[PDB]
Design a protein around this ligand. Sequence first.
Ligand SMILES: Cc1cc2nc3c(=O)[nH]c(=O)nc-3n(C[C@H](O)[C@H](O)[C@H](O)COP(=O)(O)OP(=O)(O)OC[C@H]3O[C@@H](n4cnc5c(N)ncnc54)[C@H](O)[C@@H]3O)c2cc1C
Ligand SMILES: NC(=O)C1=CN([C@@H]2O[C@H](COP(=O)(O)OP(=O)(O)OC[C@H]3O[C@@H](n4cnc5c(N)ncnc54)[C@H](OP(=O)(O)O)[C@@H]3O)[C@@H](O)[C@H]2O)C=CC1
Length: 515
Amino acid sequence: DFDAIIIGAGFGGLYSLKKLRDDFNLKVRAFDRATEVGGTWFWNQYPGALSDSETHLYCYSWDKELLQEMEIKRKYISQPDVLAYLKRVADKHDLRKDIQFETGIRSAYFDEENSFWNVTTENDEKFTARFLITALGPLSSPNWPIIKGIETFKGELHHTSRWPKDVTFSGKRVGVIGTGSTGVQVITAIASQVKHLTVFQRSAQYSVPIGNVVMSETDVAKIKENYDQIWENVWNSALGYGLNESTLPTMSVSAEERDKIFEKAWQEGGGFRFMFETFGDIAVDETANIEAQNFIKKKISEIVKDPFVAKKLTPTDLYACRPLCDSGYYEIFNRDNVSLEDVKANPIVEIKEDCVVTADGVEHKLDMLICATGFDAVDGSYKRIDIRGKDGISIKDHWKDGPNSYLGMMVSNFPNMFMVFGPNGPLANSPPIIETQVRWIADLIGYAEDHQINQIEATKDAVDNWTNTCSDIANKTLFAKAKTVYLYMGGLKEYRNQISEVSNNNYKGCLLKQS
Ligand SMILES: Cc1cc2nc3c(=O)[nH]c(=O)nc-3n(C[C@H](O)[C@H](O)[C@H](O)COP(=O)(O)OP(=O)(O)OC[C@H]3O[C@@H](n4cnc5c(N)ncnc54)[C@H](O)[C@@H]3O)c2cc1C
Ligand SMILES: NC(=O)C1=CN([C@@H]2O[C@H](COP(=O)(O)OP(=O)(O)OC[C@H]3O[C@@H](n4cnc5c(N)ncnc54)[C@H](OP(=O)(O)O)[C@@H]3O)[C@@H](O)[C@H]2O)C=CC1
């Protein structure tokens, strides 16, 4: 028996464990398939892996001594350094003694008689707990491209999600399929290391410089001396990225003024900075969105000296989402050892023992093929567990059409289960989201223990209520004319207001059962 079982030992699961064990004195065990803490920062060790958030904000805020001890080496933080940070958190707070590593959870079945969860590992070990905390992260299974003959390739074949140690690039012909955030990071990191690089691009996206520079001891001292105000700014913001979130309409200033504002953000770096510190309506007004696109289009044409390559890199969609972030991506395509293939116009039709074949019949001979082709959607990690709630309803069937929840944390028919960084949550920097959710869930569990209530479940109506306010906010946005509602788009501050009103009003929308 435990009071709570936690699935996952990334950012989300580690603070869940700290909060429930040490602040609410509950008996807790966490599980992870990994051999070490860190979650996605343990699993994802591909070349160029880098935070989107600046280093001083991509971390916990709840341990003030840890903040003052923070290593802030560069403006953004690389994967080995995030992993080392989370390892330090687990060291300082004695967390691993209550984490069972190398242990996958195969099933969790709710026992309506006892009002607790029966949790079974992949090695048939059974544990019981009143509450189930699912901290599964935003990514499900690695998505491989479905291409005839991929199994015949005899060279090195790697998905970015399983990047092996000891990979060497010198002298090799390498291909990369995929040009999302991970593909851009990999391509930028390895182009100078390989004999030849072929990029297989299905859809060009916009990318802005990230501006990753070293941090002087003075830069760092200025942050740490003001850290309380910095976090207060996070909690009162929509995105939690430390931005000065603009209200200025894009088309309310002159062309010369507009160019200077975009250039300012371009030089300082960051994708959210470009989209939301410049002007206030780029995600809302079609004309504003096109102006932002055209700024980046002009940059691509200036950086990439061959205009035919520049055209291939230039996105074609009418409206644009938030741009990627890079450390020298477009410059890569000026190199003599880089070839860009548009596989919308010239699709991949076959992989053979030594090559990728495109529809023009060209054999692209490769020593190594890197699939930066992404992951299944967030609800996949839930459906990959055999989770059965009331009446034995499985989460696979409950979410057959997509995920739906209350506040991003509670699922109807699944009592005493609480999601951390689950579907239908806010779009903001993730550590502040996870801290917000862990603290709300722990307060709810604490109120349960005080009031002797043993079953907490959100109602069908509350879920539909949450789905509607997500739909209503999203429909003021361009993001239907671009690439169930997966995200609450009201921002971090309003999300915290939303869940504060629920807890202040006796957990409206939650069925509470007393024993
Ligand atoms: C390179 C990179 C940069 C990023 N930068 C940012 C950024 O700047 N800002 C931002 O907001 N987000 C960013 N993200 C995304 C987000 O911050 C991370 O996904 C975040 O660390 C998620 O933490 P988590 O604990 O919620 O999930 P994860 O770190 O994904 O941890 C989930 C864990 O659950 C375990 N698990 C799952 N199913 C089971 C099971 N059945 N049994 C046992 N264990 C299981 C997994 O093994 C995994 O270890 C970035 C992601 C990457 C890859
Ligand atoms: N640094 C990071 O990696 C971070 C990632 N994230 C999130 O993590 C998730 C994963 O990012 P990423 O790993 O880049 O995965 P993405 O899904 O974002 O991009 C996948 C890439 O592979 C291409 N692709 C997929 N299938 C095929 C195919 N069959 N043939 C050819 N090309 C294909 C896609 O092209 P198309 O566009 O045509 O499908 C796209 O270019 C995203 O949701 C991202 O927002 C968030 C923060 C940081």
